Amino acid sequence: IKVTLPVPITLIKAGVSVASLDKTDCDTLLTVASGTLAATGSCALSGTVLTITTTSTYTPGTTTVQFTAVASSASVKILGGAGTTGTIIAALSAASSVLPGYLTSAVISGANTFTLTLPYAVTSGGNPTCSDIIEIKAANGAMKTFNGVCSVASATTVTGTTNEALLASDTVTLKGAQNALTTTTGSKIYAATAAINIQPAYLTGAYAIDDKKFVVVLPYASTLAAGTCSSIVSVTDNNNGPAESGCSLALDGTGIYLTVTVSASLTATAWKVDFKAAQTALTVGSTAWAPMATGTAKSLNAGATTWGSSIMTATAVATNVLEVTLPMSSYMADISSGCSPVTFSTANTAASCKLIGTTSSPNSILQITLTAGYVAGAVSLANAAGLIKAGSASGTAIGAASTVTIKPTFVSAVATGPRTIVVALPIQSKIIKGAGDTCDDDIASPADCSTIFSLTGGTATIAGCSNPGSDFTAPYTTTVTLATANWVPGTTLSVAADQAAAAATNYLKPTAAITLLYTTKPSGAVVIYPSISS
């Protein structure tokens, strides 16, 4: 407890000078109700603030401080002013009542949201204006505006959102005078506080990159010290119960990809990750990160809860181009001639490989290139030398996913009339009447091609098509018909959902491997373009 005297003071001795007093000496001078002074260093003084240390714990409503009257001949007392000539202070007409004056913690929960935790419960229900109760500063001393009204979330928590983005090295305090924050134990009003940084909670997401490793995407650039991994993070295994035994961490030079290496294999759609309630070796500048805002650990998000030869998928986009997917953004030099990271099964060979990526997942695709037409086979990633490093330019080598199949998808589409569309294919094909693995061919012009081809972007629909008749060994092509209205540009072409649903009355298959069906492109659906008529 800290007591502020309105004027200067001196703590008196049996000798000359004064620095601090022990328990027995300080206990005569003053008396705190239902309390007990610290066994040593109880009466330290400096300036006009007197610091009292206790072995007890403050509890609102029942804690108060009082001073005693000390005889003139005593050898320890409190005078007024400086020096050693002052007058002995007296008691107080009513013992001063102590107030709550500190916070438990403050964390970031989304770059526009924050939450403050109170040590002593208060009443629930209310909409205080954030300007009246909270203050936030930046590293340079600026201040931040609030968007909306703070909410009395619970007994010990209040929430709000700010107009500007939050940063770790911010500081937060309270303006303590207001009625709304009244403890239900003692009916006291919260007082002012000191400055504490806001530690970063919440994460972007986690992505397995091996059988026993995964990468956590931190929104901020961190720095990592030499510390034992088991005391930094709390990984949870398939069925709950701690599993952070014997782990190890590493951070890339850019400081944004934190790779965990656990001693047990990761599986299925489970496992979580969190940060310790007390740790200091992993800090975004200030001192440390913090546990998650909500009281649950983060989960390796859906779709990447594992990595191996069941997540990787290669696709045939052109007669001499593949498209292999990867767990997340990777790094590698654009390899000039051939490319070693991969090895094909049957007979296909490579001339170079590069990185391409969709809009929302950059550099997540390896686009291998070949020196011939693609023969049916399977690509088996090895990465043995170590080129495709995960996340960034110094991350960790990605895991192998050997023996994954190669499967086709549409290549192009044009419109040679108001209701005609020629659709191209990368490997020889042949339509097959349904009832959907291998039954029998179809006539050279059916009328129910609406279960294989599908339109998105207009009021037209699909009617008829020409079976591909064992053609070129080059632009393997076909034609399609439209039904209700003229084709309006901007439509896109995809595989109808019936092909995988076993509901179509005719299917498209390749000749060299009649098991495989037709899949949907990774990098984006096909765009119809217009072309000449006659």
3-state secondary structure string across 361-406: EEEEEEEEEECCCCCCCEEEECCCCCCCEECCCCCCECCCCCCEEE
Are the C-beta atoms of 380 and 342 separated by less than 8 Å?
Answer: yes
Whether the CA torsion 270, 276, 281, 286 is positive or negative: it is positive
Q: Return d(Cα 325, Cα 315) in angstroms, integer.
A: 9
Are the C-beta atoms of 435 and 505 separated by less than 8 Å?
Answer: yes
Are the C-beta atoms of 486 and 421 separated by less than 8 Å?
Answer: no
In this structure, what token pair is assigned to residue 93?
């007409």
Are the C-beta atoms of 457 and 523 separated by less than 8 Å?
Answer: no
Q: Return d(Cα 351, Cα 274) in angstroms, integer.
A: 44
Are the C-beta atoms of 509 and 430 separated by less than 8 Å?
Answer: yes
Are the C-beta atoms of 448 and 389 separated by less than 8 Å?
Answer: no
In this structure, what token pair is assigned to residue 19?
């620095």
H or E element that contains 13: none
For residue 138, what are the contacts with CB-CB under 8 A and spacing of at least 6?
144, 167, 169, 170
In this structure, what token pair is assigned to residue 268?
């299925």
Q: Return d(Cα 528, Cα 524) in angstroms, integer.
A: 13
Task: List Cα–Cα distances, 83 to 3, 41, 88, 111, in angstroms.
Answer: 21, 22, 13, 53
In this structure, what token pair is assigned to residue 514?
């009649």
Q: Return d(Cα 27, Cα 505) in angstroms, integer.
A: 94
In this structure, what token pair is assigned to residue 294?
């909500």
H or E element that contains 26: helix 23-29
Are the C-beta atoms of 76 and 12 separated by less than 8 Å?
Answer: yes
Instruction: Tell me which residue of 396, 406, 466, 447 sits closest to 216, measured CA to CA.
Output: 396
Helix (H), strand (E) counts: the chain: 3, 42
Q: Return d(Cα 392, Cα 403) in angstroms, integer.
A: 26
Whether the CA torsion 171, 177, 180, 181 is positive or negative: it is positive
Q: Return d(Cα 91, Cα 209) in angstroms, integer.
A: 70
For residue 175, what are the contacts with CB-CB under 8 A and spacing of at least 6?
132, 133, 134, 135, 192
C-alpha triplet 468, 472, 474: angle, nearest 5°: 105
Query: For the sheet containing 157-161, what is the strand order?
Result: 151-154, 157-161, 113-117, 105-108, 199-200
Q: Return d(Cα 51, Cα 1) in angstroms, integer.
A: 6
Resolution of the experimental model, in Å, one decimal: 3.1
Provide the β-strand partners of residue 413.
423
Instruction: Tell me which residue of 217, 205, 229, 215 sits closest to 279, measured CA to CA.
Output: 229
Q: Find the DSSP H helices in 476-516.
A: 498-501
Are the C-beta atoms of 10 and 29 separated by less than 8 Å?
Answer: no
> Residue 499, SS3?
helix
Phi, psi at residue 389, to the nearest 5°? Answer: -90, 140
Quote the DSSP letter at residue 101.
-
> Residue 132, SS3?
helix
H or E element that contains 24: helix 23-29
Are the C-beta atoms of 383 and 439 separated by less than 8 Å?
Answer: no
Are the C-beta atoms of 485 and 503 separated by less than 8 Å?
Answer: no
Which burial class, exposed, middle or buried, applies to 187 when counting CB atoms under 10 A from its CB (0-12, 13-18, 19+)? exposed
Instruction: Tell me which residue of 515, 501, 510, 506 sits closest to 450, measured CA to CA.
Output: 506
Are the C-beta atoms of 245 and 260 separated by less than 8 Å?
Answer: no
Q: Return d(Cα 438, Cα 410) in angstroms, integer.
A: 21
Q: Return d(Cα 216, Cα 206) in angstroms, integer.
A: 5
- For residue 172, the tally of other CB atoms under 10 A from its CB is 22
- The half-sphere exposure of 391 on its side-chain side, counting CA atoms within 13 A, is 26
Are the C-beta atoms of 71 and 29 separated by less than 8 Å?
Answer: no
Quote the DSSP letter at residue 511.
S
Residue 371 region by backbone torsions, left for phi larger than 0, else alpha for psi between -120 and 50, else beta: alpha
Experimental method: cryo-EM
For residue 317, what are the contacts with CB-CB under 8 A and spacing of at least 6?
323, 409, 411, 426, 521, 523
Instruction: Tell me which residue of 316, 334, 352, 349 sits closest to 388, measured CA to CA.
Output: 334
Are the C-beta atoms of 378 and 309 separated by less than 8 Å?
Answer: no
Write down the residue that tokens 């007890």 correspond to: 56
Total count of residues recorded for the chain: 534
Instruction: Tell me which residue of 303, 244, 293, 268 sits closest to 106, measured CA to CA.
Output: 293
Instruction: Tell me which residue of 62, 303, 367, 321 sits closest to 187, measured CA to CA.
Output: 62
Are the C-beta atoms of 274 and 292 separated by less than 8 Å?
Answer: yes
H or E element that contains 530: strand 529-530
Task: List Cα–Cα distances, 133 to 178, 300, 508, in angstroms.
Answer: 7, 37, 66
Q: Return d(Cα 316, Cα 123) in angstroms, integer.
A: 63
> How are beta strands 404-408 and 378-381 bridged, if at all?
antiparallel
Q: Return d(Cα 12, Cα 89) in angstroms, integer.
A: 12
Residue 364 region by backbone torsions, left for phi larger than 0, else alpha for psi between -120 and 50, else beta: alpha
